[PDB]
């Protein structure tokens, strides 16, 4: 029972299980289930082949998921980098890009302490 990835964690309800798709969160999962017809309170174990085929087509009909979405994100980042903008410069330097504070924080953009 695979959509693109495995997406069949052992004994998960369908709305939560769908979030394991890279590109679907809770809201996307809720509208997927509402659109197809499968109820949220239903385990991924008890999913039929026809239910799977219904919810399969509808994700590439509308949404964007593993692979192409991951390509588009890095495409945007790379475009910013070689266009020569301020955000791209900060992407190259490995610094926060949305105007954060770098005096005492930014420990996610930077790694752990380097202890000069």
């Amino acid at each position: 029972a695979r959509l693109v990835g495995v997406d069949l964690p052992r004994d998960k309800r369908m709305e939560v299980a769908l979030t394991y798709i890279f590109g679907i969160g809770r809201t996307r999962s809720n509208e997927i289930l509402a659109a197809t017809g499968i109820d949220r309170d239903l385990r991924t174990r008890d999913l039929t082949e026809e239910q799977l085929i219904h919810l399969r087509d509808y994700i590439e009909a509308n949404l964007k998921v593993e692979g192409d979405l991951r390509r588009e994100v890095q495409a945007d980042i790379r475009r910013k980098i070689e266009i020569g903008c301020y955000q791209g410069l900060r992407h190259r330097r490995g610094m926060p890009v949305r105007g954060q504070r770098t005096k005492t924080n930014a420990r996610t953009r930077k790694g752990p302490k380097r202890t000069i």
Binding site: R2, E49, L52, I53, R56
Partner: protein, 57 residues
């Protein structure tokens, strides 16, 4: 050497979600094998910054 070395290898049946059905002989799976995608349904077998600015404005 073929006494008790190779696994079972007997006629099976492949059925796909689209409906493309054929049959060969596979391993341990006893009879029919049900698949979701095949070579007859999978894609790749079946086939502007200024634009965005103007469609925004």
């Amino acid at each position: 050497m073929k006494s008790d070395i190779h696994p079972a290898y007997e006629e099976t049946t492949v059925v796909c979600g689209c409906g493309n059905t054929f049959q060969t002989r596979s391993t341990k799976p006893g009879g029919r094998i049900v698949v979701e995608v095949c070579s007859q349904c999978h894609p790749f077998y079946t086939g502007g910054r200024v634009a965005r600015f103007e469609k925004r404005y």
